[PDB]
Ligand binder design. Structure first.
Ligand SMILES: NC(=O)c1ccc[n+]([C@@H]2O[C@H](COP(=O)([O-])OP(=O)(O)OC[C@H]3O[C@@H](n4cnc5c(N)ncnc54)[C@H](O)[C@@H]3O)[C@@H](O)[C@H]2O)c1
Ligand SMILES: NC(=O)c1ccc[n+]([C@@H]2O[C@H](COP(=O)([O-])OP(=O)(O)OC[C@H]3O[C@@H](n4cnc5c(N)ncnc54)[C@H](O)[C@@H]3O)[C@@H](O)[C@H]2O)c1
Ligand SMILES: NC(=O)c1ccc[n+]([C@@H]2O[C@H](COP(=O)([O-])OP(=O)(O)OC[C@H]3O[C@@H](n4cnc5c(N)ncnc54)[C@H](O)[C@@H]3O)[C@@H](O)[C@H]2O)c1
Ligand SMILES: NC(=O)c1ccc[n+]([C@@H]2O[C@H](COP(=O)([O-])OP(=O)(O)OC[C@H]3O[C@@H](n4cnc5c(N)ncnc54)[C@H](O)[C@@H]3O)[C@@H](O)[C@H]2O)c1
Ligand SMILES: Cc1cc(=O)c(-c2ccccc2)c(C)[nH]1
Ligand SMILES: Cc1cc(=O)c(-c2ccccc2)c(C)[nH]1
Ligand SMILES: Cc1cc(=O)c(-c2ccccc2)c(C)[nH]1
Ligand SMILES: Cc1cc(=O)c(-c2ccccc2)c(C)[nH]1
Lengths: 261, 247, 262, 250
């Protein structure tokens, strides 16, 4: 069991297609004891999380709510049992209003929308670490989800900016986590056909070119309908097998980003 | 001169130590016709800009004020004259509340403070391009100020995250600017004493003087010129070559 | 164990301080079945490899010898048994004459010396893959050792150039390995006190001390140069099935030093 | 009042009038630079090509694989520019890779002897030229080399990619040496030029300001900008004159 006896917090489950769902499933398969955090539709998330191989407490967490962050540690402790701490934290949270991601021109995203997206997608990574590092064990691991933002691309627009910011946040979180003997890293994954992944002919064709370029580039290929390789990479970072890796990005994209054509 | 007859907008002058002040001075020395944008203390900024070698109209621009952005192009046109356009735009705007940049712990910066900083330091680069690209000429150049955020460091804290965001914004602005025949780039400058640093002069193969902004100002002018015509969505490093050296 | 039943080739053992020795030890502890390759002093290497927790066949491999590479696959097959293939290959080979790595000025390294170093440290990664990919299994993993060469530094000189070339070789090897369902990655490690101060004199002794001490200061989780286990563990992670979508890439086992400025 | 007025510059790498070096030399001359040219192997043919440049320039023989040429190069340049005068700029536009390590030939089928000759000419020689010409270079000087972005693998480019990865590393070490003379060292990572169809086509779409492979002037202009006094704080670095394609995914 890769994660045998490890207590791990998993945020970001909304559907069974969610990257977090797959992380949670693989982590449980690998012996982990999870705590799950959900946003807004908690009774709907519970029906989904009931599909996971093992039972796990579900706690409410809106990263934009300062009360949820202030009480999160006390609530996790109550769930895992007093005297027990977390060995891992998984941030699989992202959000960008349609104005900043999709068909809307780059220049037409109002800052209020961009700011909500950066708050949820990038700032919250620090918010979660701030809240959960006091209840984390030495040898611990914080993992976040990334989509390589080193180059501009169509449609992604302001979410590309939020990922650029998240990569910077990660590096600063590693400085803090280090003080606790905790590692902080991001998994930069290739495109995964979640429920969200209708937009019209132009954008439908844009996502087809990205998805098709990914598999051509990827020397080992890229299956967008399979989230298991991503989930297994997060679990590798949660394990004890990458003990000298922190403030870094691990690419689970089939190698696509290392190839030009 | 390097920018003879070029009409260039320069934002970010507050003191004579400001990076923008040096860009403006070197650009004027190189034949550029300037339009200057100031923020908040406009009568004070006019006292300071009067110190440059040539006269230049001063316009108010608060990047957080949507009215200023909506009228900016019409106000620049009025200043340079109807029928004339900008050949260059310089973004030398940055801000981060003390909670997000300095001795305050990284985790203690409230998001409202971080958001104001990202708005001013990163989002505004797109706001200025959106406002000024319709009144820009083919062959034009938009330049922004950067401080290499690729690796974390002490104190820079949330301003590093704003810089990381600005680098991403610049790559997207280049896609838009490109439709107008305009280049968009950032100058990742070394530390400058304008109103962390010592290792820079050692690391830099050609050295680094923090008390001198002229090498940074010159690089911005090179990017504003016609001598880097195939460079866009990129970062030019004017830091004495420190970022390429480990020790 | 992490590598239970996996047949893995490990090159680069010369002493028990060797990074490869630690990879081999951790891999055996994790259930791997090993084949070991040695250079020049085979009787010497056999004495060291006898210290590993399990017995493993030792084969001769000089990466500059074309006969050694041409017969390597047939020799590995003979050792693991016909009908069996490798699930992993570990390249822990590096060399740079004193002329190009150390106190000697950068400009004073003759090309013949630079070329031998690039041959051993960078070209050989492709040579090993060319030789061992026909006898590798889908799901396989080739791992190479790296030292972050993205920025220049004192004394590393031409070995930085060899690492810069090796990083490029790896990306091309991933294109080839990919056709076999094999991944190809590098572990960019922080400095480790292997067998290979005072020897270089005052000036350079102090230079390598600042470089080495900068790693623990920069690394948010610290850096112990007297410990190869974290590096060995990362190689094993790359050899496992837990990074299945990572290829042509570099994994940094440096305490996170390369992500920090100061 | 040209960009490079009165600057004495060495330009290596002219073989045809399609050569990137030919365009650097032409735009440098147009900008006031006094040039010294170095040629390889077919020197009488290289003289026929340089006679097409705007101004007269001495032509010297330089085979980067020849140790005698490198050892005498400085003395020969000094003789050409005049005793008491030094170089303000050096341009390395030299590259070579046998067909075994670049093209349709499988990556694994390139023998090391071929790879080594290519790395010698394309990467090591950048340090060889600096070693030879830095003693005869002025403070404020500039050494520029030609690059093709090797940060990601691609088809055909094969071992040449590895040579450019090595050259980028050599450039960073040359900056440490050049720095002692008050000299900068940089590379121009240029987009593709006709001096492969997917490279050449994919480039103009991705590049926000477009990319014309039939035009070397934008590349020549960037080299001249690096040779000028307008990038005085840039060393050990790479300037991308590629239309901006490398900053773009699609
Ligand atoms: N789907 C892909 O192709 C892909 C690729 C790379 C990276 N990612 C990243 O993976 C992560 C998860 O994406 P996914 O594709 O699994 O999508 P998803 O829609 O299943 O999950 C995003 C999650 O964020 C949560 N969330 C939104 N606002 C929140 C708030 N205020 N507080 C707390 N939680 C909030 C949502 O409820 C949801 O659970 C994101 O960071 C995303 O950017 C996705
Ligand atoms: N100072 C350095 O060492 C250094 C190094 C690299 C990059 N930079 C960057 O260079 C730029 C200029 O900084 P500086 O060092 O000249 O300092 P500064 O104090 O002179 O400049 C910052 C400018 O931003 C302006 N500004 C702030 N909020 C604004 C708003 N809402 N609307 C309009 N203008 C606003 C200020 O008035 C000022 O003119 C910044 O973007 C900074 O991040 C600075
Ligand atoms: N020691 C460090 O601090 C450090 C840091 C990062 C990377 N590395 C890398 O780790 C790898 C192994 O080095 P190490 O530190 O364990 O030292 P080492 O001396 O044990 O390893 C180098 C190995 O290369 C072998 N070798 C040399 N020439 C050969 C040839 N022609 N054919 C076959 N094998 C040959 C040697 O016999 C030796 O086993 C190298 O690639 C090195 O660059 C070392
Ligand atoms: N053409 C492109 O698409 C392109 C793009 C980016 C970079 N480059 C680089 O630009 C440089 C010049 O290439 P080019 O496209 O102008 O073609 P080219 O063939 O005209 O230039 C290469 C030059 O190197 C010289 N040379 C070769 N071996 C030599 C030796 N042993 N000693 C001395 N000189 C020697 C040749 O004589 C020739 O003049 C190369 O470094 C190349 O990699 C080319
Ligand atoms: C390829 C890709 C990357 C992402 O980050 C997201 C994403 C963005 C916001 C919220 C959730 C996922 C999507 C849908 N696709
Ligand atoms: C080294 C350095 C980098 C910067 O970005 C700024 C800066 C930050 C906000 C506003 C103005 C300048 C400073 C003062 N120094
Ligand atoms: C820090 C470091 C990096 C290296 O690559 C080697 C090395 C160089 C050549 C051969 C073997 C190891 C050493 C000793 N140290
Ligand atoms: C795109 C591109 C890159 C290069 O390096 C060369 C090249 C290779 C060897 C010698 C000269 C140029 C060419 C022709 N094209």
């Amino acid at each position: 069991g890769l994660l045998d006896g490890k207590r791990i917090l998993v945020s970001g489950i909304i559907t069974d297609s969610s990257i977090a769902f797959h992380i949670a499933r693989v982590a449980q398969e690998q012996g982990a004891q999870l705590v799950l955090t959900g946003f807004d539709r908690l009774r709907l998330i519970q029906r989904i999380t009931d599909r996971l191989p093992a039972k796990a407490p579900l706690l409410e967490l809106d990263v934009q709510n300062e009360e949820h962050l202030a009480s999160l540690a006390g609530r996790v402790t109550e769930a895992i049992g007093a005297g027990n701490k977390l060995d891992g934290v998984v941030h699989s949270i992202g959000f960008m209003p349609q104005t900043g991601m999709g068909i809307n021109p780059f220049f037409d995203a109002p800052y209020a929308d961009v700011s909500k997206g950066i708050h949820i997608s990038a700032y919250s990574y620090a918010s979660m670490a701030k809240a959960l590092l006091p209840i984390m064990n030495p040898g611990g691991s914080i993992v976040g989800m990334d989509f390589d933002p080193s180059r501009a691309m169509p449609a992604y627009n302001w979410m590309t900016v939020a990922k650029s910011a998240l990569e910077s946040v990660n590096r600063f979180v590693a400085r803090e986590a280090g003080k606790y003997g905790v590692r902080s890293n991001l998994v930069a994954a290739g495109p995964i056909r979640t429920l969200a992944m209708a937009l019209g002919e132009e954008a439908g064709a844009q996502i087809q070119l990205l998805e098709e370029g990914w598999d051509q580039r990827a020397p080992i290929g890229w299956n967008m309908k399979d989230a298991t390789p991503v989930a297994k990479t997060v679990c590798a970072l949660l394990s004890d097998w990458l003990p000298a890796t922190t403030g870094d990005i691990i690419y689970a994209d089939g190698g696509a980003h290392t190839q030009l054509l």
